Coordinates of C-alpha atoms and ligand atoms in Angstrom, one line a residue:
Chain A
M1 CA 0.0 0.0 0.0
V2 CA 1.2 3.5 -0.8
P3 CA -0.2 7.0 -0.3
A4 CA -2.0 8.8 -3.2
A5 CA 0.4 11.2 -5.0
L6 CA 0.8 12.9 -8.4
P7 CA 3.8 11.5 -10.3
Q8 CA 7.1 13.4 -10.0
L9 CA 7.8 15.7 -12.8
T10 CA 11.3 16.4 -13.8
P11 CA 12.7 19.4 -15.7
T12 CA 12.8 17.6 -19.1
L13 CA 10.4 17.9 -22.1
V14 CA 9.6 14.2 -22.2
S15 CA 8.5 14.3 -18.5
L16 CA 6.0 17.1 -19.3
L17 CA 4.8 15.3 -22.5
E18 CA 4.0 12.2 -20.3
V19 CA 1.9 14.3 -17.9
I20 CA 0.0 16.2 -20.5
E21 CA -0.7 13.2 -22.8
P22 CA -4.5 12.9 -22.9
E23 CA -6.1 9.8 -21.5
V24 CA -7.3 7.2 -24.1
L25 CA -11.0 7.9 -24.8
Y26 CA -13.7 5.3 -24.9
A27 CA -16.1 5.6 -27.8
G28 CA -19.3 4.8 -25.8
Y29 CA -19.9 2.3 -28.5
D30 CA -23.3 0.8 -29.0
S31 CA -22.3 -2.6 -30.4
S32 CA -26.0 -3.5 -31.0
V33 CA -25.9 -1.9 -34.5
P34 CA -25.5 -4.1 -37.6
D35 CA -22.1 -4.1 -39.3
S36 CA -21.9 -1.5 -42.0
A37 CA -19.1 0.6 -43.5
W38 CA -21.2 3.8 -43.5
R39 CA -22.3 3.3 -39.9
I40 CA -18.7 2.6 -38.8
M41 CA -17.3 5.6 -40.6
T42 CA -19.8 7.9 -38.8
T43 CA -19.0 6.3 -35.5
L44 CA -15.3 6.8 -36.1
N45 CA -15.8 10.5 -37.0
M46 CA -17.8 11.1 -33.8
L47 CA -14.9 9.6 -31.8
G48 CA -12.5 11.6 -33.9
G49 CA -14.1 14.9 -33.0
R50 CA -13.7 14.1 -29.3
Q51 CA -10.1 13.1 -29.8
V52 CA -9.3 16.3 -31.8
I53 CA -10.7 18.5 -29.0
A54 CA -8.4 16.6 -26.6
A55 CA -5.5 17.2 -28.9
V56 CA -6.2 20.9 -29.1
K57 CA -6.0 21.0 -25.3
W58 CA -2.8 19.0 -25.4
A59 CA -1.2 21.3 -28.0
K60 CA -1.9 24.4 -25.9
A61 CA 0.2 22.9 -23.1
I62 CA 3.3 22.1 -25.3
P63 CA 6.0 24.7 -24.3
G64 CA 6.1 27.5 -26.8
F65 CA 3.0 26.5 -28.8
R66 CA 0.9 29.1 -27.3
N67 CA 3.6 31.7 -28.0
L68 CA 3.2 31.3 -31.7
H69 CA 0.8 33.7 -33.5
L70 CA -2.8 32.5 -33.0
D71 CA -3.1 32.0 -36.8
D72 CA 0.0 29.7 -36.7
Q73 CA -1.6 27.7 -33.9
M74 CA -4.9 27.2 -35.9
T75 CA -3.0 26.4 -39.1
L76 CA -0.7 23.9 -37.4
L77 CA -3.7 22.1 -35.9
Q78 CA -5.7 22.1 -39.1
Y79 CA -2.8 20.8 -41.1
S80 CA -1.7 18.2 -38.5
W81 CA -4.8 16.8 -36.9
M82 CA -5.0 13.7 -39.1
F83 CA -1.3 13.0 -38.4
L84 CA -1.9 13.2 -34.7
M85 CA -5.0 11.0 -34.8
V86 CA -3.5 8.3 -37.1
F87 CA -0.3 8.1 -35.1
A88 CA -2.1 7.7 -31.8
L89 CA -4.4 5.1 -33.4
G90 CA -1.2 3.4 -34.6
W91 CA 0.2 3.4 -31.0
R92 CA -3.0 1.9 -29.5
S93 CA -3.1 -0.7 -32.2
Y94 CA 0.6 -1.6 -31.7
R95 CA 0.4 -1.8 -27.9
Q96 CA -3.0 -3.6 -27.7
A97 CA -2.8 -5.7 -30.8
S98 CA 0.7 -5.8 -32.2
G99 CA -0.6 -3.9 -35.3
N100 CA -3.0 -6.6 -36.3
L101 CA -6.4 -5.0 -35.4
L102 CA -7.5 -1.3 -35.5
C103 CA -7.8 -0.2 -31.8
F104 CA -9.8 2.9 -32.0
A105 CA -10.9 2.8 -28.4
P106 CA -11.0 0.0 -25.7
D107 CA -14.7 -0.4 -26.6
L108 CA -14.2 0.0 -30.4
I109 CA -11.7 -2.5 -31.9
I110 CA -12.1 -3.3 -35.5
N111 CA -11.2 -7.0 -36.2
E112 CA -10.0 -8.6 -39.4
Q113 CA -13.5 -9.5 -40.7
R114 CA -14.8 -6.0 -40.2
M115 CA -11.6 -4.5 -41.7
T116 CA -12.1 -6.6 -44.8
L117 CA -15.7 -5.6 -45.5
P118 CA -16.1 -4.2 -49.1
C119 CA -16.0 -0.5 -48.3
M120 CA -13.7 -0.9 -45.2
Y121 CA -10.8 -2.9 -46.9
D122 CA -8.9 0.0 -48.5
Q123 CA -9.3 2.6 -45.9
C124 CA -8.5 0.2 -43.0
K125 CA -5.3 -1.0 -44.7
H126 CA -4.1 2.7 -44.8
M127 CA -5.2 3.3 -41.2
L128 CA -3.4 0.2 -39.9
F129 CA -0.1 0.8 -41.7
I130 CA 1.7 3.0 -39.2
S131 CA 0.8 0.6 -36.4
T132 CA 2.7 -2.2 -38.3
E133 CA 5.8 0.1 -38.5
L134 CA 5.6 1.0 -34.7
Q135 CA 5.5 -2.8 -34.1
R136 CA 8.4 -3.5 -36.5
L137 CA 10.6 -0.8 -35.0
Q138 CA 9.6 -1.6 -31.4
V139 CA 9.0 2.1 -30.7
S140 CA 9.2 3.1 -27.0
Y141 CA 6.7 5.3 -25.3
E142 CA 9.2 8.2 -24.9
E143 CA 10.1 7.9 -28.6
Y144 CA 6.4 7.9 -29.5
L145 CA 5.7 11.1 -27.4
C146 CA 8.5 13.0 -29.0
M147 CA 7.6 11.8 -32.5
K148 CA 3.9 12.8 -31.9
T149 CA 4.9 16.3 -31.0
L150 CA 7.0 16.5 -34.1
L151 CA 3.9 15.5 -36.1
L152 CA 2.1 18.6 -34.7
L153 CA 5.1 20.5 -36.2
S154 CA 5.5 18.7 -39.6
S155 CA 3.2 20.6 -42.0
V156 CA 3.2 24.4 -42.5
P157 CA 1.9 26.9 -45.0
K158 CA 4.0 27.1 -48.2
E159 CA 4.6 30.8 -47.6
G160 CA 5.8 30.2 -44.0
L161 CA 4.3 30.9 -40.6
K162 CA 3.9 34.3 -38.9
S163 CA 6.1 33.1 -36.0
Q164 CA 8.5 31.2 -38.1
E165 CA 11.7 31.7 -36.1
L166 CA 10.0 30.6 -32.8
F167 CA 8.4 27.6 -34.6
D168 CA 11.8 26.5 -36.0
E169 CA 13.3 26.7 -32.5
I170 CA 10.4 24.7 -30.9
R171 CA 10.7 22.1 -33.6
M172 CA 14.4 21.6 -33.1
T173 CA 13.8 21.2 -29.3
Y174 CA 11.7 18.2 -30.1
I175 CA 14.1 16.8 -32.7
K176 CA 16.8 16.9 -29.9
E177 CA 14.3 15.4 -27.4
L178 CA 13.7 12.4 -29.8
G179 CA 17.5 11.9 -29.9
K180 CA 17.6 11.9 -26.1
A181 CA 14.8 9.3 -26.0
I182 CA 16.7 7.1 -28.4
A183 CA 20.0 7.6 -26.5
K184 CA 18.4 6.8 -23.1
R185 CA 18.0 3.2 -24.4
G186 CA 21.7 2.9 -23.8
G187 CA 22.8 1.9 -27.4
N188 CA 26.2 2.9 -28.8
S189 CA 26.8 5.9 -31.0
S190 CA 26.4 4.0 -34.2
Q191 CA 23.1 2.4 -33.0
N192 CA 21.9 5.9 -32.0
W193 CA 22.6 7.3 -35.5
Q194 CA 20.9 4.3 -37.1
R195 CA 17.8 4.5 -34.9
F196 CA 17.4 8.3 -35.4
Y197 CA 17.6 7.8 -39.1
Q198 CA 14.9 5.1 -39.0
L199 CA 12.5 7.1 -36.8
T200 CA 12.9 10.2 -39.0
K201 CA 12.2 8.0 -42.1
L202 CA 9.1 6.9 -40.2
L203 CA 8.0 10.5 -39.5
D204 CA 8.5 11.3 -43.2
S205 CA 6.4 8.3 -44.3
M206 CA 3.5 9.8 -42.4
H207 CA 2.8 12.3 -45.1
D208 CA 1.9 9.7 -47.8
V209 CA -0.2 7.8 -45.3
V210 CA -2.1 11.0 -44.4
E211 CA -2.6 11.8 -48.2
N212 CA -4.3 8.4 -48.5
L213 CA -6.6 9.1 -45.5
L214 CA -7.4 12.8 -46.3
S215 CA -8.7 11.6 -49.7
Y216 CA -11.3 9.5 -47.8
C217 CA -12.0 12.2 -45.1
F218 CA -12.5 15.0 -47.6
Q219 CA -14.7 12.9 -50.1
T220 CA -16.9 11.5 -47.4
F221 CA -17.2 15.0 -45.8
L222 CA -18.0 16.7 -49.1
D223 CA -20.5 14.2 -50.7
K224 CA -23.5 14.8 -48.4
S225 CA -25.4 12.1 -50.3
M226 CA -23.1 9.5 -48.7
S227 CA -24.8 10.4 -45.4
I228 CA -21.6 10.0 -43.4
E229 CA -21.7 12.4 -40.5
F230 CA -19.0 14.5 -38.8
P231 CA -19.2 16.3 -35.5
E232 CA -19.0 20.1 -35.5
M233 CA -15.4 20.5 -34.5
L234 CA -14.2 18.2 -37.2
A235 CA -16.5 19.6 -39.8
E236 CA -15.2 23.1 -39.2
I237 CA -11.6 22.0 -39.3
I238 CA -12.2 20.0 -42.5
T239 CA -14.1 22.9 -44.1
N240 CA -11.1 25.1 -43.5
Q241 CA -8.5 22.5 -44.4
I242 CA -9.8 21.5 -47.8
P243 CA -9.1 24.8 -49.5
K244 CA -5.6 24.9 -48.2
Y245 CA -4.9 21.3 -49.2
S246 CA -6.4 21.7 -52.7
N247 CA -4.6 25.0 -53.4
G248 CA -1.3 23.1 -52.6
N249 CA -0.6 25.3 -49.6
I250 CA 0.2 22.4 -47.2
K251 CA 4.0 22.1 -47.2
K252 CA 5.5 18.9 -45.6
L253 CA 8.7 19.3 -43.5
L254 CA 10.7 16.2 -44.5
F255 CA 13.9 15.1 -42.9
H256 CA 15.0 13.2 -46.0
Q257 CA 15.3 14.0 -49.7
Chain B
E1 CA -15.0 30.6 -40.2
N2 CA -12.9 29.1 -37.3
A3 CA -15.2 29.9 -34.3
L4 CA -15.0 26.5 -32.6
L5 CA -11.2 26.0 -32.9
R6 CA -10.6 29.6 -32.0
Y7 CA -12.8 29.3 -28.9
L8 CA -10.9 26.3 -27.7
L9 CA -7.6 28.0 -28.2
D10 CA -8.6 31.0 -26.1
Ligands
DEX301 C1 -10.3 6.8 -43.9 C2 -10.7 8.1 -43.0 C3 -9.5 8.3 -42.0 C4 -10.4 8.2 -40.7 C5 -9.8 8.8 -39.4 C6 -8.3 8.1 -39.1 C7 -7.8 8.7 -37.8 C8 -8.7 8.6 -36.6 C9 -8.3 8.0 -35.4 C10 -9.3 7.9 -34.4 O1 -9.0 7.3 -33.3 C11 -10.7 8.3 -34.6 C12 -11.1 8.9 -35.7 C13 -10.1 9.2 -36.8 C14 -9.9 10.7 -36.9 C15 -10.7 8.6 -38.1 F1 -10.7 7.2 -38.0 C16 -12.2 9.0 -38.4 O2 -12.3 10.4 -38.4 C17 -12.7 8.4 -39.8 C18 -11.7 8.8 -41.0 C19 -11.8 10.4 -41.2 C20 -12.0 8.0 -42.3 O3 -12.4 6.6 -42.0 C21 -13.1 8.6 -43.1 O4 -13.0 9.4 -43.9 C22 -14.6 8.2 -42.7 O5 -15.6 9.1 -43.1

């Protein structure tokens, strides 16, 4: 038996990331519904809006984020939300299912049969991919936390942000934090170099994954005849994101050529 | 155009 206590923070970025990471949300899933791709998609979007609200609260607590121009803050969240949602879905699916099942929430796990329904097959393959890479690379929780912050900071307007210099500084702090997370494992210098290379390749690969997923998100959002619903938060973000995406304004910040 | 997200951020 031990007394109740809050965990001990330390003066490191990863320690703060651990305390501000939002708790995993339950979907409040009514599993009595029949299996259908359209119903599943709506359910996922309603969960997604709740996760995005939690992610906005998380971003506000990231050191320096709130010091960027308010427009930069909105833009970064509009450009990165899908990255944040898919990477966290990847983490849950890796930790709970070794990347074999889509773990949206503890009460919403999409199995192989459901993932292979006619109109689920393609999108689920894309959604599950990053989980298989987290599994392959055996990513640690500290590595994951640092990488997830880098994803908030991986896409910017082509013309630059209003607070560009500060943004570059913040981004470099998390690149360095990722290196520290890798190094803490106790590998030698060569292994550290190799692992940093592999994890930054993984970060870069997120852009093509997200392109695959935004194609579904935007088409199901726009074609109202499909009757796939989105909550207000998400609908607003998507409404604002599409014009930037389609005008080619979303610039990816790649580590590698 | 960004009411909800702006509200959360403030
Ligand atoms: C293939 C796309 C990509 C999907 C998103 C992938 C990321 C994600 C992780 C979650 O934990 C909850 C909801 C989201 C954020 C999501 F799963 C839903 O929003 C449904 C989504 C947009 C999609 O299934 C649709 O476009 C359905 O309309």
